[PDB]
Nucleic acid binder design. Structure first.
Lengths: 44, 49, 174, 49, 195
RNA sequence: CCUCGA
DNA sequence: GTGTCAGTAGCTGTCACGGATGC
DNA sequence: GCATCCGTGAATCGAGGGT
């Protein structure tokens, strides 16, 4: 039970308030260890 | 560098063009580095000179 | 002077207007991806700015040096990182979607463990739920419950066998 | 009139008479009305959800 | 700029429009449109009506129009852009990872050019590519030619995840696929009762 | 996305 | 480290409809 | 002020096979 569903423009402060960190590096994972690279698109 | 949300620029009608009274094609030239745009002009200093 | 620093910017903008569009076509054939060709052009002209020897002699074709730098950049992209990953896209058809099994077998075991747990003493039940459900060490449970080290070892030793009694009495498969 | 209804907008004939009901009793001018026919495709997108 | 630069200030790209929105009185431009609406020619009134529909929205709601220009882009969680392994040892990934990856490469290149003091032509011509890359992440194909993948196939964008029969709304929200169900061939059974 | 069934 | 020409494939064989975009 | 051109839409479920 929740009444309303509000939608709106995401302030740049909201975009940063959601993010658990910035994606600096462009790498994805390692193709040998299957470990996601740090600060990559899969940073743990 | 700041970037524009394509949903509000290219989606018809162009929401930015309606907000700033700028034509969509004129707005297209600005965003994609085809034309400069005047942000401010000191009209009073110009009058005194 | 300040005009000497601006003459270098008007020199880069000059080689942009004569070589960038032709270099983009060359990288576009070698990669096939327009977004990748733009990345090769920016990186090639960036190395031109970092090498005044190539921008010095106008009587020597700087275009040929650009095609060679772009060619070497493209073959390096064509190595290990592209080798494994570039193959498939989940959005693309022909790739099986990931699935996760149902929790039926896990839910039935959890129900039978919860029944055998209820028929235990409050001491034994509060020790197996701190060793297997909370994952603490033997000394950690001894510290919490204020009992001896061997007391936790003995309670765990019996409570496991007590549960094995109740499960084998109900026909749980070994 | 005295309403916040943007002129030219298509509003449900229940909020219009309920909003003009408060402004008429408030002293201000009630908003004007004119019946408008909308297609089923256009009316669906105009829903309040 | 070389002559009368002391008197005006101009700029290019998206950062300029960010500046145009900042030096903008929302309430003033709203009442200017209403004045045109109260007494005006329908030829030039419809164009002022529709503008008010957009401007008054930013006025009452209390949200700034600056949100239409982004300083940071969010990254979608990994399980929604998963990378799956193939039975041949190779890998298959979601299109979004390529789209996000291509934005990151150009965004990291911009930090290099700004630090290196590259010519204004490269920094400006790079920001455009960052704008075109971010335009593809949200709605690839909306402006111009779509970002082609391997095989001249237009890559799916975030907005493609919601459109049409395959989008999230119609395919995964209005109808799910359910447990406790089956299907088989039908055969007439005359002896059966109606119930 | 190839072929096919109501 | 790089240095004589050195330059996509593919493709239009859909259409009705509305309204912002543009001369 | 109007012709152009842009973007939006175009039935439901189901089987099997390749990359």
């Amino acid at each position: 039970f929740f009444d309303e569903l509000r939608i709106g423009l995401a302030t740049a402060e909201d975009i940063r308030q959601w993010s658990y960190g910035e994606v600096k590096k462009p790498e994805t994972i390692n193709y040998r260890t299957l470990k996601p690279e740090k600060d990559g698109l899969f940073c743990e | 560098a700041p970037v524009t949300h394509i949903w509000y620029f290219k989606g018809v009608p162009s929401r930015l063009g309606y907000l700033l009274d700028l034509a969509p094609k004129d707005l297209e030239k600005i965003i994609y580095f085809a034309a400069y745009v005047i942000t401010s002009v000191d009209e009073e200093m110009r009058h005194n000179e | 002077v300040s005009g000497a620093a601006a003459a270098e910017a008007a020199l880069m903008r000059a080689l942009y207007d004569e070589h960038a569009a032709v270099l983009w076509r060359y990288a576009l054939r070698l990669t096939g991806d327009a977004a990748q060709a733009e990345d090769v052009v920016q990186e090639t002209l960036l190395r031109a700015w970092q090498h005044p020897e190539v921008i010095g002699d106008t009587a020597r074709p700087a275009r040929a040096w650009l095609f060679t730098v772009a060619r070497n950049m493209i073959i390096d992209e064509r190595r290990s990182a592209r080798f494994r990953n570039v193959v498939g896209s989940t959005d693309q058809s022909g790739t099986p979607e990931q699935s996760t099994p149902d929790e039926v077998n896990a839910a039935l075991d959890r129900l039978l463990i919860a029944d055998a747990l209820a028929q235990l003493s409050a001491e034994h039940r509060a020790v197996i739920q701190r060793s297997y459900y909370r994952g603490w060490s033997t000394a950690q449970i001894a510290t919490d419950l204020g009992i001896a080290e061997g007391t936790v070892k003995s309670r765990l030793h019996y409570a496991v066998r007590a549960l094995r009694l109740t499960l084998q009495e109900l026909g749980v498969t070994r | 009139g005295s309403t916040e209804f943007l002129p030219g907008s298509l509003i449900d004939r229940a909020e219009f008479e309920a909003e003009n009901r408060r402004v008429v009793a408030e002293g201000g001018e009630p908003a004007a009305g004119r019946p408008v026919l909308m297609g089923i495709t256009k009316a669906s997108l105009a829903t309040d959800s | 700029v070389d002559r009368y630069g002391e008197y005006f200030t101009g700029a290019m790209g998206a950062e300029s429009i960010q500046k145009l929105i900042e030096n903008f009185d929302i309430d003033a431009e709203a009442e200017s449109l209403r004045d045109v609406i109260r007494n005006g020619k329908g030829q030039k009134k419809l164009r002022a009506l529709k503008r008010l529909k957009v401007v008054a929205a930013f006025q009452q709601s209390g949200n700034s129009p600056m949100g239409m220009v982004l300083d940071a882009v969010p990254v979608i969680p990994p399980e929604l852009r998963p990378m799956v392994q193939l039975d041949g040892g190779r890998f298959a990934t979601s299109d979004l990872n390529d789209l996000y990856r291509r934005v990151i490469n150009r965004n990291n290149r911009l930090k290099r050019l700004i630090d290196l003091g590259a010519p204004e032509i490269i920094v400006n011509n790079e920001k455009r590519m960052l704008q075109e890359s971010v335009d593809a992440l949200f709605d690839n194909g909306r402006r111009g030619r779509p970002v082609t993948g391997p095989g001249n196939r237009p890559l799916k964008s975030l907005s493609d995840l919601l459109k049409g029969k395959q989008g999230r709304f119609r395919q995964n929200l209005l109808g799910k696929r359910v447990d406790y169900s089956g299907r088989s061939v039908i055969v007439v059974g005359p002896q059966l009762k109606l119930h």
